[PDB]
Amino acid sequence: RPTFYRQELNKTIWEVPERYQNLSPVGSGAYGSVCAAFDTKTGHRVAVKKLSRPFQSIIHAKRTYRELRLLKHMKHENVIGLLDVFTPARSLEEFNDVYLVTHLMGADLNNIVKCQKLTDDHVQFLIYQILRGLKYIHSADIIHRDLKPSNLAVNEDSELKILDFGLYVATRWYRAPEIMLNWMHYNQTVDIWSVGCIMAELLTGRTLFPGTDHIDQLKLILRLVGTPGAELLKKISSESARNYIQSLAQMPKMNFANVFIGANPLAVDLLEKMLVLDSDKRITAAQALAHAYFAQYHDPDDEPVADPYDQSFESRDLLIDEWKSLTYDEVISFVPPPLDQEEME
Ligand SMILES: Nc1nccc(-c2c(-c3ccc(F)cc3)ncn2C2CCNCC2)n1
Ligand SMILES: CCNC(=N)N[C@]12C[C@H]3C[C@H](C[C@H](C3)C1)C2
Ligand SMILES: [Ca+2]
Ligand SMILES: [Ca+2]
Numbered sequence: 621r622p623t624f625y626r627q628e629l630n631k632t633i634w635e636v637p638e639r640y641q642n643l644s645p646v647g648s649g650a651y652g653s654v655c656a657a658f659d660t661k662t663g664h665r666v667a668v669k670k671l672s673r674p675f676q677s678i679i680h681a682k683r684t685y686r687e688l689r690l691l692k693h694m695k696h697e698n699v700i701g702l703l704d705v706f707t708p709a710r711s712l713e714e715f716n717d718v719y720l721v722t723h724l725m726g727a728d729l730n731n732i733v734k735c736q737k738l739t740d741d742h743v744q745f746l747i748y749q750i751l752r753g754l755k756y757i758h759s760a761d762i763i764h765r766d767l768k769p770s771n772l773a774v775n776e777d778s779e780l781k782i783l784d785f786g787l788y789v790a791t792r793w794y795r796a797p798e799i800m801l802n803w804m805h806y807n808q809t810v811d812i813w814s815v816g817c818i819m820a821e822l823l824t825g826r827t828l829f830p831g832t833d834h835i836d837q838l839k840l841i842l843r844l845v846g847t848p849g850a851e852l853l854k855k856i857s858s859e860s861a862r863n864y865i866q867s868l869a870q871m872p873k874m875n876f877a878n879v880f881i882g883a884n885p886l887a888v889d890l891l892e893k894m895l896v897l898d899s900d901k902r903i904t905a906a907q908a909l910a911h912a913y914f915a916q917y918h919d920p921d922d923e924p925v926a927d928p929y930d931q932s933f934e935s936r937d938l939l940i941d942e943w944k945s946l947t948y949d950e951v952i953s954f955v956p957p958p959l960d961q962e963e964m965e
């Protein structure tokens with residue numbers, strides 16, 4: 621049995637195995653807060669997330685189970701997965717705290733594009749990695765729904781992982797219009813809209829749709845992509861919203877080549893395929909990986925899909941103690957991955 625120690629971090633007690641040393645706060649995460657640490661077993665740097673009040677209500681309890689199940693399933697180089705999960709509890713009766721461990725990623729994408737005019741080759745690499753991770757999560761019927769630069773973890777060598785998928789005023793600047801405006805049906809390509817917004821900003825250094833509210837954001841979007849047809853109204857429940865959109869003066873789609881002046885023409889073409897209002901016409905992650913913009917990185921042998929993921933629990937209402945016990949089971953059954961899981965191609 622491992623020995624634990626206590627340390628006050630972010631004004632609360634963390635209780636962690638002696639294996640993890642030199643804890644230092646590196647910000648909040650979904651439903652928790654994060655510390656960087658040194659893993660003395662392997663000499664690797666890790667990030668430890670302490671979940672906040674994981675079993676306070678059925679909402680917290682089910683989201684704790686959801687996140688642990690999700691992260692235990694994710695095994696992809698561009699997606700946050702788990703090195704460890706631990707609790708100081710010695711039994712289910714004592715179980716009230718959950719800590720998740722992953723490889724340390726020092727930055728988010730805002731740290732990459734803020735003070736650096738990125739080269740096109742570098743933008744290609746960043747977007748390629750997002751799309752590789754999305755192909756994997758989408759293949760398990762998992763969608764992000766709120767993909768944005770602050771949900772992309774990046775290390776010192778620009779290697780990137782998607783986080784907080786499948787789950788305070790948040791930015792809406794990167795959200796798919798069908799999500800932001802609560803349209804009646806959508807698909808995995810909500811995340812592709814977000815990729816387009818991120819890519820546009822990496823190329824120009826400026827936010828693509830910096831709307832002040834949902835109406836202002838929609839107007840900015842429609843100025844670029846043009847007014848939609850009546851078919852798109854099919855997806856919108858609110859009559860007031862439909863009447864408003866229909867009432868707007870007709871706007872043509874802009875030529876993206878005139879918007880992204882001086883960009884690689886292949887980048888412009890890809891943006892045209894991502895930034896489309898009709899979600900059934902939007903390019904998928906797998907299709908985008910085959911686009912010529914990524915020719916120097918694309919490798920079909922290294923763009924894997926996910927093992928099937930059983931999400932039957934999502935439709936079930938269980939008691940708090942049932943979610944807690946299921947979560948405890950998943951903590952106990954966790955098998956740490958090998959330190960080296962890759963081989964030369
Ligand atoms: N520095 C760093 N490195 C890797 C991940 C994170 C992380 C996690 C997280 C998730 C699961 C887990 F098991 C451990 C940590 N949740 C939010 N963040 C963010 C902390 C600040 N914004 C960027 C990443 N932070
Ligand atoms: C913040 C920097 N500036 C722009 N994002 N400007 C935009 C960019 C794109 C979409 C809409 C309408 C046009 C074309 C002008 C906004
Ligand atoms: Ca390769
Ligand atoms: Ca490596």
Ligand SMILES: [Ca+2]
Pocket residue numbers: 960961962963964
């Ligand atoms: Ca190896």
Ligand SMILES: [Ca+2]
Pocket residue numbers: 921965
């Ligand atoms: Ca090969």
Ligand SMILES: [Cl-]
Pocket residue numbers: 693928929930
């Ligand atoms: Cl599974």
